[PDB]
Amino acid sequence: DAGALPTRYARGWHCLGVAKDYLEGKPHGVEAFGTKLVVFADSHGDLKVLDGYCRHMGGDLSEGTVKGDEVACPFHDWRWGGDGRCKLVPYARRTPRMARTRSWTTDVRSGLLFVWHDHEGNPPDPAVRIPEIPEAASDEWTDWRWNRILIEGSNCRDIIDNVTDMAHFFYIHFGLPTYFKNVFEGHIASQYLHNVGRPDVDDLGTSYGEAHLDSEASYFGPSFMINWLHNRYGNYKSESILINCHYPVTQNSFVLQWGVIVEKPKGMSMTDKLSRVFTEGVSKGFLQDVEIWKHKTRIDNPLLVEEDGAVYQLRRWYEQFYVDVADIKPEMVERFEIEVDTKRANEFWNAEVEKNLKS
Amino acid sequence: DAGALPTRYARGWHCLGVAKDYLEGKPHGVEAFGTKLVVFADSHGDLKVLDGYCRHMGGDLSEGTVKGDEVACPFHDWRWGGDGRCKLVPYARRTPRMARTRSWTTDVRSGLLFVWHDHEGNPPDPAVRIPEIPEAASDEWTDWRWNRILIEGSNCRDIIDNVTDMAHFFYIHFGLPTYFKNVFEGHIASQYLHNVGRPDVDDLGTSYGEAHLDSEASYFGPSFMINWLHNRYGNYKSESILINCHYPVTQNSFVLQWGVIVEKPKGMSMTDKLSRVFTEGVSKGFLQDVEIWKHKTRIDNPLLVEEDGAVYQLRRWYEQFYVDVADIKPEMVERFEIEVDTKRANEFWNAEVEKNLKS
Amino acid sequence: DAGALPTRYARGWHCLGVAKDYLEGKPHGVEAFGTKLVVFADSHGDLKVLDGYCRHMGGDLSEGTVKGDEVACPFHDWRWGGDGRCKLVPYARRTPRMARTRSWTTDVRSGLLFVWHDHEGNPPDPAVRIPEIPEAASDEWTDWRWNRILIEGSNCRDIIDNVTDMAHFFYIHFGLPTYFKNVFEGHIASQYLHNVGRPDVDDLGTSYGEAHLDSEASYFGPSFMINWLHNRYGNYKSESILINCHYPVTQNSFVLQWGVIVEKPKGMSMTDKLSRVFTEGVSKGFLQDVEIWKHKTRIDNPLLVEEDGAVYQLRRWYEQFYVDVADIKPEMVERFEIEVDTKRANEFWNAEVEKNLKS
């Protein structure tokens, strides 16, 4: 190899997408966690998730209908509540007593739908709830532009390695990482970055390329990352938020999603034109990661240099989600920090940048 | 789960389709029973089935030719009789002596081709021969309109559960089952039905919907069902026969077939126009089952109500085909009958029908 | 069955195609031997092969670039020499010391690229080097017209059985084998053939069909065959060379390739017109084998007649490549010859040829 497959899917919150796309006003089928899931909303507009296959004789609940607070199976119309309780068998003398299917705990946060997953079958620790993003509810920000792809032939765990790599900021995103720090603690892993645009990549000048980016990116649990993007072109500031999230479909396939909201420029003219530019731009930055992730294997026992930083400590952090809560080791979870020195690399890269535009 | 896969394919007769489609005058390839099969007719027009792969060096006999009473392998022209005997190697000094491949016992019944399958390798019990349908040879009836699909991702055993379910007649076929009885005995499982058209499903009236259907449906062995359809619209009677049959390709894929013949209306004008309407109509009734079967799992340990009827007894009946003939249990095979009470359901359903057209 | 899958890929030289197609001047991805391979040339134009996945964090080297004598990984630009040595990590203070990936020994012979494979991980025995074909470097011959297909659902070992079969020359290639001899010795298996065109296959005459073909075909190791084709139409001689070669992708899939060069006719008129006819013609002869190979299984325990010749001795020869060099048995490798008597078959076939054109 590199790498024996996980035997479970990770314990945590997984984002299924934009909440308003699961509300129309039918059930939705999602394949996830090696099964099929049914997603549907209440008569109160509250979102529920169940095993997708009817416990009676196997009808696909996602092919059925919402009737009041229950999804009705397409086959014989039995009625399943968001808590999994069989509420009614319409034509029967006696609805089964205290029957239920598996229900999944759900959370709507920042206009996004999350489901909880735990192999051990325990409910969500309140301590690991996904944070609200205030700007998702601001009329001063755009609303989620959201994308999703299916990646086959790898495990979702392959993509989290990005948290820890300073050097790809140059080769993949075409900037110069001038500051690089990782923090792991509890259920959160973070990356803090200062990045400068490269002069040799067509937005130079001189005196007219020169974006500076300050980035904080955090994983809140195993699968969901918020990235706060503050960049500048001199004195022109722009603010954005990129969501990088995934959920496993299989141990060899997963859905990768990304969303972007931007602080609307005031403005102007509508000003939608310029927000599309800001959005498509963060989107293209994400898509440069996808190109790599799409054509790469995971390396279980990597050849590492000092500049790799905290690769092992990050993999140790991520293990916590795959062990029973009772088996979590201090060192998975205790505060770890590392600043990666980017000064030699930056002098090498500036030399290569210089070398390139001397032509 | 629901359900550990069978380790054998069922012992019995399996229909391969309309006999006249296997007669033209070449061999035919069929994948079935986890292998490849070759089908071909005699110089007497008698139909034979063999393992499809030549015992010499593996040529695909279905890619070859019929020469007299033998199929000639495309590779080196060896000649295989319908009983599996190597009859000739044309260029050789000495044809192998008492060499053979596996041959499959065949039956042409009602213009349909059947092959026999038994894991134990024993020949067909005469007691289980598939019955003749006289109307398949009547010029007073239409001839087989026949359809076939490949279902991937399930086992063929999933579809036989339909024999025992009264309630889908309402939700799936949009009628009201007014009488419902099952009989299992020997190698045959039967369903007897009286069904009334629903007023809320656009053929009402009042006084102008109102079909009454009397249905007898029997499985003759594991895979082949004849359904006798007698319905009325007042005094206008119509007669039809639906064949529901399948054969396994793999333990996770099978071919589902259906054929319909109708009693031709006298007539009239040709009268082909009206026979097409009668045929397409039974066909669409079958296709409503297919929609369910296409998007459903089998439930091995189902949540059952009283109205489910004889679900366990039917699964016990079907087991007989998967055990060695010597291991068949009395209770698989002894006469079992159940009438399912449809009176409460029918009052519930009439209320819902009433509720619907009050709008 | 027929046949338990090999547990290794064969020890020997495998042809990857025309060397000039791997030189342009980027790396190439090839799937082979159950992995992914990267192919690239030097700054000296010398061709190298490595494991395709970067040992750092798994980037696909075939998606990267050639920089001097090394392929640069697309992910972080590490630099890998044709011998597998990590030569530089560009941005790092310290390149890893004495780090390497797996490199594959390479050979350019007759304008074709070969890679060496050995489960035991030993280098190429000089004794088994693939011979030069002088005519591949002659301006009196055409240059490689080359074709490649992917065969899924079989093992590459299935096709080598052709070496030993006289009778397919009639049924598959439509000629009459008048002389047939096999020689196995060491790492080489050979077929010597005299073939006459069939009168009943539209190039008769009389006095105007009547090609005579003298053929020598040799496997040099497990996967690569040169076939020298000398045929005549009376006094008009033509010379060609067909390469039949393959490499395994998986134990159930492989790439089959074929190339043809012809002695250019002098000439004439350009004379390219006639060389295309000669080439397309050998190509179509090869393609008649492919039709069989595409629709056939391997038979592990075949029903054989005397006319089958040395089927077992050929399979025993081929075993050598699948055992450890230390475990090769005398009888795999010692000189074996057999002439197959084609006289009775030829009288049978002439009778059938006669029978056919009497119509």
Ligand code: FES
């Ligand atoms: S299968 Fe769901 S109601 Fe019967």
Ligand code: FES
């Ligand atoms: S493979 Fe069937 S005749 Fe040789």
Ligand code: FES
């Ligand atoms: S993955 Fe190849 S250089 Fe890092």
Ligand SMILES: [Fe+2]
């Ligand atoms: Fe990135």
Ligand SMILES: [Fe+2]
């Ligand atoms: Fe039905």
Ligand SMILES: [Fe+2]
């Ligand atoms: Fe051949």
Ligand code: NA
């Ligand atoms: Na790093």
Ligand code: NA
């Ligand atoms: Na029922």
Ligand code: NA
């Ligand atoms: Na032979």
